[PDB]
Amino acid sequence: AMIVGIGIDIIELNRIEKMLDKFMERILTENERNVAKGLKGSRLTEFVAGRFAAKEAYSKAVGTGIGKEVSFLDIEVRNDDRGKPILITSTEHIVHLSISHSKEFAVAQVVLESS
Amino acid sequence: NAMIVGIGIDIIELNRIEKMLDKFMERILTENERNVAKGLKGSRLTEFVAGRFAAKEAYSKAVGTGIGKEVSFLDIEVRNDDRGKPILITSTEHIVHLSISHSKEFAVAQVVLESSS
Amino acid sequence: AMIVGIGIDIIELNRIEKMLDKFMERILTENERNVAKGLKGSRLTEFVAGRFAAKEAYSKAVGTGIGKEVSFLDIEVRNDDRGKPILITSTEHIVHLSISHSKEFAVAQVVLESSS
Ligand SMILES: Nc1ncnc2c1ncn2[C@@H]1O[C@H](COP(=O)(O)O)[C@@H](OP(=O)(O)O)[C@H]1O
Ligand SMILES: Nc1ncnc2c1ncn2[C@@H]1O[C@H](COP(=O)(O)O)[C@@H](OP(=O)(O)O)[C@H]1O
Ligand SMILES: Nc1ncnc2c1ncn2[C@@H]1O[C@H](COP(=O)(O)O)[C@@H](OP(=O)(O)O)[C@H]1O
Ligand SMILES: Nc1ncnc2c1ncn2[C@@H]1O[C@H](COP(=O)(O)O)[C@@H](OP(=O)(O)O)[C@H]1O
Ligand SMILES: Nc1ncnc2c1ncn2[C@@H]1O[C@H](COP(=O)(O)O)[C@@H](OP(=O)(O)O)[C@H]1O
Ligand SMILES: Nc1ncnc2c1ncn2[C@@H]1O[C@H](COP(=O)(O)O)[C@@H](OP(=O)(O)O)[C@H]1O
Ligand SMILES: [Cl-]
Ligand SMILES: [Cl-]
Ligand SMILES: [Cl-]
Ligand SMILES: [Cl-]
Ligand SMILES: [Cl-]
Ligand SMILES: [Cl-]
Ligand SMILES: [Mg+2]
Ligand SMILES: [Mg+2]
Ligand SMILES: [Mg+2]
Ligand SMILES: [Mg+2]
Ligand SMILES: [Mg+2]
Ligand SMILES: [Mg+2]
Ligand SMILES: [Mg+2]
Ligand SMILES: [Mg+2]
Ligand SMILES: [Mg+2]
């Protein structure tokens, strides 16, 4: 039983942009917000959307969705020195993540692997 | 001997499915799925049919054949478990991993087929 | 340590189309351009777009993105006899790939698996 689950999510950026007009306090952890403070405009919108999509994708990979087991603030998406997104949450599994965002959409995928 | 036999992804414009809906469903949805579709309306029915189409198509790409003589729409059933997680049921010796998502205008599905040996 | 990495990419087709109207020579290898040479209109655009995205998604799977270790011309995406996309590049890993394209968007994903 190597793959524990997979999850994908697609988000319309304008939906996030609208929700941004305290939404970020609900989606992004303290560390993520400190990164977001240095972003603006479309970049901030796509960053928030990317994180949302990553966390949701991850919650689908576990099979529960955002809820009592896993919510937004239990997860932190960090970018490594190369810019590669790393998902940090308490779990026995290996989390593989990827994100992409065009001008109007963001997508994220997660593959959970047994350790 | 790869543990992953194949992967598949599909993106579908919801307005295209909505037009096709305006019988299309009898071709894409099995009987259990249509019974589930019966209780849906408007955007929900459209996104539901779209997600099924995409899950099935994505699965067929994971097998590497696409929808055709080996695999077609009616050989596959996508049911949601009690938590809402989509489960793909078809005759195969492999483990099927699936995920679906649908915004207001797009639906996306992905499949990863894993070897059970 | 089964999966070495995964990569996803979404591209707006009209963006690639604008870049087309030089560019293909930067994104497509010789073999790939000989295929593209027989395509036109939206089919050529989606084709190039799916290649861009496949190659970009592969580079994310590697964890470096397009750059000094992996660039577009180091990678060739072929279609087998059934139409399935096969990613050909220098690596010790098994490359799993998929592409999809609607009227307005192309998406590609990659899962890299370790051989051992
Ligand atoms: N000639 C070119 N060919 C391919 N990609 C290009 C390009 N010029 C810019 N880009 C990419 O398109 C995006 C536009 O960003 P910018 O505002 O700096 O132009 C950037 O990528 P990302 O979208 O991956 O960051 C950038 O790398
Ligand atoms: N038999 C098969 N198995 C897996 N993938 C396939 C396939 N035949 C075609 N594809 C992929 O499906 C892509 C298009 O998907 P969709 O029809 O969802 O847009 C193709 O884009 P290319 O033909 O540009 O390579 C191809 O890469
Ligand atoms: N607990 C759960 N785990 C994994 N996936 C789930 C889930 N609950 C719902 N989903 C999937 O998420 C899809 C919708 O994703 P999103 O909300 O991002 O649009 C659902 O589409 P269906 O209800 O059409 O099957 C369903 O397949
Ligand atoms: N304040 C909020 N923050 C984040 N998501 C919200 C929200 N209010 C509603 N949503 C989500 O956005 C969608 C809105 O649907 P509606 O408002 O018509 O019920 C639902 O998710 P899904 O699309 O995942 O089902 C819902 O859970
Ligand atoms: N070296 C790398 N390897 C893998 N993924 C990377 C990467 N550098 C950046 N990314 C991911 O690519 C995303 C953008 O994708 P695209 O260029 O296709 O829009 C980034 O979103 P964030 O910068 O918002 O975290 C990031 O998570
Ligand atoms: N009645 C039908 N039901 C489902 N799909 C159909 C269809 N008629 C055509 N298609 C699909 O619509 C796409 C474009 O149509 P055409 O090439 O005939 O103009 C093709 O798929 P792809 O987009 O996967 O190639 C084709 O297979
Ligand atoms: Cl959305
Ligand atoms: Cl992001
Ligand atoms: Cl959720
Ligand atoms: Cl098909
Ligand atoms: Cl784009
Ligand atoms: Cl890149
Ligand atoms: Mg969602
Ligand atoms: Mg982007
Ligand atoms: Mg398709
Ligand atoms: Mg949902
Ligand atoms: Mg939805
Ligand atoms: Mg990209
Ligand atoms: Mg980038
Ligand atoms: Mg097709
Ligand atoms: Mg297409």
Residue numbers in the entry:
A (entry chain B): 0 to 20, 24 to 117
B (entry chain A): -1 to 20, 24 to 118
C (entry chain C): 0 to 20, 24 to 118
From the paper:
The active form of ACP is produced by a post-translational modification of a conserved serine residue of apo-ACP by a 4′-phosphopantetheine (P-pant) group transferred from CoA bound to a holo-(acyl-carrier-protein) synthase (AcpS). AcpS belongs to the phosphopantetheine transferase (PPT) family of proteins, binds CoA and its derivatives and requires magnesium for activity. The AcpS trimer binds three CoA molecules and three ACP molecules. The AcpS monomer has an elongated elliptical shape and possesses an α/β fold.
The structure of AcpSBA is emphasized because of the two 3′,5′-adenosine diphosphate (3′,5′-ADP) product molecules that are found in each of the three coenzyme A (CoA) binding sites of the trimeric protein. One 3′,5′-ADP is bound as the 3′,5′-ADP part of CoA in the known structures of the CoA–AcpS and 3′,5′-ADP–AcpS binary complexes. The position of the second 3′,5′-ADP has never been described before. It is in close proximity to the first 3′,5′-­ADP and the ACP-binding site. AcpSBA only gave well diffracting crystals when the protein had the tag removed and it was pre-incubated with CoA. However, the presence of 200 mM MgCl2 in the crystallization condition appears to have been sufficient for the AcpS to hydrolyze the 10 mM CoA in the crystallization mixture even in the absence of ACP. Mg-III is also a distance of ∼5 Å from Mg-I and Mg-­II and bridges ADPI and ADPII in the AcpSBA structure. Lastly, it is important to stress the specific ADPI 5′-P–ADPII 3′-P interaction through Mg-III. Although we think that ADPII is a crystallographic artifact, the biological relevance of ADPII should be further investigated. For example, the presence of a bulky ligand that would mimic the two bound 3′,5′-ADP molecules at the interaction interface between two adjacent monomers in the AcpS trimer may prevent the binding of CoA and/or the formation of a productive CoA–AcpS–ACP complex.
